């Protein structure tokens, strides 16, 4: 059948791709630069697909082949093709190339291919052994470049334990590996390990532990924008649970801004959900466009109903949407925040009143916010003013709420501070861009 | 004799703390920023049609930054010193 | 209709007059330059696709 022949063709182009990747790994090893490693792991997700049993069998029978225990470990875990007519001997290593032991980069990359393919076959137990052997091999290695590769497999390791639904037999190991990376002053490995540990903490709901670590540990700035986005999302969740709502909103906005354009639909959906919830907690109505995006329409539709209910001020609609779709929030891990918003809706009305009016009396505020008594209105407006949501003061002598008069900000030092932040960022960008300049010898 | 020949073009101490005419500084900023606008148009056209605006833009930026930074710092020093 | 510059204060009954500050040409040209290098950044986004 010609279909099998075309499958063989795409398989051998994948073989060429992985040959190029291992060549780049060796060039990084012999070129004293880790950026080639980063490029190899950047091409890694693209070739994580398009592979089958024979692709990996020919890979492991083309590389390694030094009669080491590696062959005895990875060959039995995957099937083998029959005596095919096209017995094209794929041997990237010839003689002395096959004689020397494989570099940690190439062996780690091929073992990574084994574990991701095994995961794609959805038999997690088989991949568990290969991952454990991989990280037994790479634990002793202190290669700086390998850490990059190590970083990636680190993530994959946690990933497989997600399908094993344990996430706890390895928590101590991730802690120790993160500590090792910290003493190695590594950037990528430390960042990815922090992200994985935070994900584990939130999966097991240990928010206090995550808050303690993020207070103690420092996320490396010089990390991947993807890892930065994951860390920002986790930190935003932490601050939202810790009631630090404004900082959580800012952090989640930064995470959304650093999202991979249109690559991670699920991560963007979760970030949008949490950001909408926390923004509602602040009393700010979110952007409407979020609900009309092609990928986030149905996902945020219950949140559209929630936002409509709170903006309209109909607490009955709030309870109704809690009854029908609120259970979904439990699957989304936001139910507690939604209850907090159920009991914090009135903040949005107070903010609206402050935005529109400037000297509205307490009785008018109570009338427009469905508050039973003017004294309750006084309490609510005073609390909102104290909690940094309103910029007014209540003249209790005659009961009117005078907002702080708007002063010409350009005549103040605020524009200077904003321009200072912008100038510092621009100068830092110029320094970073000129600092590398990558002039080869 | 080297130092006392240097005394010829040496600026006085009052020149360091003096401030350029503010009404003139604004006009200079307006002019150079408008030239930078024309230069940015030329730079966009050149970069887009690639697959000397850059040098001129860099020189204008150097001029603007040095002028404004020096004027601002002189202003701060004068505000603190004379009270 | 952008005739004689001033604003009526109906609250007490007044028509104030002022001198209509010019526009600060520097800021308008700065906005134009910001737009221009936004275009330049889009052009660089068209580049950098060659790794």
């Amino acid at each position: 059948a010609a279909a099998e022949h075309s499958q063989r063709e795409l398989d051998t182009v994948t073989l060429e791709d992985i040959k190029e990747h291992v060549k780049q790994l060796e060039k990084a090893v012999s070129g004293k630069e880790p950026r080639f490693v980063l490029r190899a792991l950047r091409m890694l997700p693209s070739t994580s697909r398009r592979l089958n049993h024979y692709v990996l069998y020919k890979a492991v029978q083309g590389f390694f082949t030094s009669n080491n225990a590696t062959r005895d470990f990875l060959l039995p875990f995957l099937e083998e093709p029959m005596d095919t007519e096209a017995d094209l001997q794929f041997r990237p290593r010839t003689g002395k190339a096959a004689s020397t032991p494989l570099l940690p980069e190439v062996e780690a990359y091929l073992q990574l291919l084994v574990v991701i393919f095994m995961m794609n076959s959805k038999r997690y137990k088989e991949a568990q052994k290969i991952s454990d052997d991989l990280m037994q091999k790479i634990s002793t290695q202190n290669r700086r470049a390998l850490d990059l590769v190590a970083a990636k497999c680190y993530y994959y390791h946690a990933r497989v334990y997600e399908f094993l639904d344990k996430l706890d037999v390895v928590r101590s190991f991730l802690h120790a590996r993160l500590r090792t990376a910290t003493l190695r002053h590594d950037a990528d490995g430390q960042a990815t390990l922090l992200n994985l540990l935070l994900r584990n903490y939130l999966h097991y709901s240990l928010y206090d532990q995550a808050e303690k670590l993020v207070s103690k540990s420092v996320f490396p700035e010089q990390a991947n924008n993807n890892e930065w986005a994951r860390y920002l999302y986790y930190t935003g969740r932490i601050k939202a649970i810790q009631l630090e709502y404004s900082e959580a909103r800012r952090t989640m906005t930064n995470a959304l801004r650093k999202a991979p354009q249109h690559t991670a639909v699920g991560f963007k959906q979760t970030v949008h959900k949490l950001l909408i919830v926390v923004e509602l907690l602040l009393g700010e109505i979110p952007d409407r466009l979020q609900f009309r995006q092609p990928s986030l329409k149905r996902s945020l539709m219950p949140y559209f109903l929630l936002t409509q209910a709170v903006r309209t001020g109909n607490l009955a609609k709030f309870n109704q949407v809690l009854d029908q779709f609120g259970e979904k929030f439990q699957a989304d891990g936001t139910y507690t925040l939604i209850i907090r918003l159920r009991h914090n809706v009135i903040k949005t009305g107070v903010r609206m009143i402050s935005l529109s009016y400037s000297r509205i009396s307490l009785a008018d505020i109570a009338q427009k916010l469905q508050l039973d008594s003017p004294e309750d209105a006084e309490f609510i407006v005073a609390k909102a003013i104290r909690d940094g949501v309103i910029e007014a003061s209540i003249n209790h002598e005659k009961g009117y709420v005078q907002s702080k008069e708007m002063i010409d900000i350009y005549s103040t030092r605020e524009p200077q501070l904003a321009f200072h932040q912008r100038i510092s960022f621009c100068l830092d960008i110029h320094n970073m861009s000129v600092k590398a300049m990558r002039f080869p010898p | 004799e080297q130092k006392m020949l240097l005394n010829l073009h040496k600026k006085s101490w009052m020149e360091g703390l003096t401030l350029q005419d503010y009404s003139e500084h604004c006009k200079h900023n307006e002019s150079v920023v408008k030239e930078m606008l024309e230069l940015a148009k030329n730079y966009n056209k050149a970069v887009e049609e690639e697959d000397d605006p850059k040098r001129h833009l860099e020189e204008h930026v150097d001029v603007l930054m040095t002028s404004n930074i020096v004027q601002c710092l002189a202003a701060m020093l004068d505000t603190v010193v004379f009270k | 209709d952008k005739k004689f510059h001033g604003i009526l204060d109906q609250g007490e009954g007044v028509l104030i007059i002022f001198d209509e500050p010019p526009v600060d040409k520097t800021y308008e040209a700065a906005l134009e330059t910001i737009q221009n290098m936004s275009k330049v950044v889009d052009s660089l986004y068209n580049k950098a696709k060659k790794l």
């Binding site: 590398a436 | 603007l64 404004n68 | 580049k47 950098a48």
Partner: peptide
């Protein structure tokens, strides 16, 4: 701030051009 932004964009363009040039040389070597 405008001048600093201009300089940063120019530096970014220069870095992109330099990376393109060194990759072009590396691929043309083979």
């Amino acid at each position: 701030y405008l001048a600093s932004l201009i300089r940063s964009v120019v530096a970014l363009h220069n870095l992109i051009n330099n990376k393109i040039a060194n990759r072009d040389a590396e691929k043309k070597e083979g």
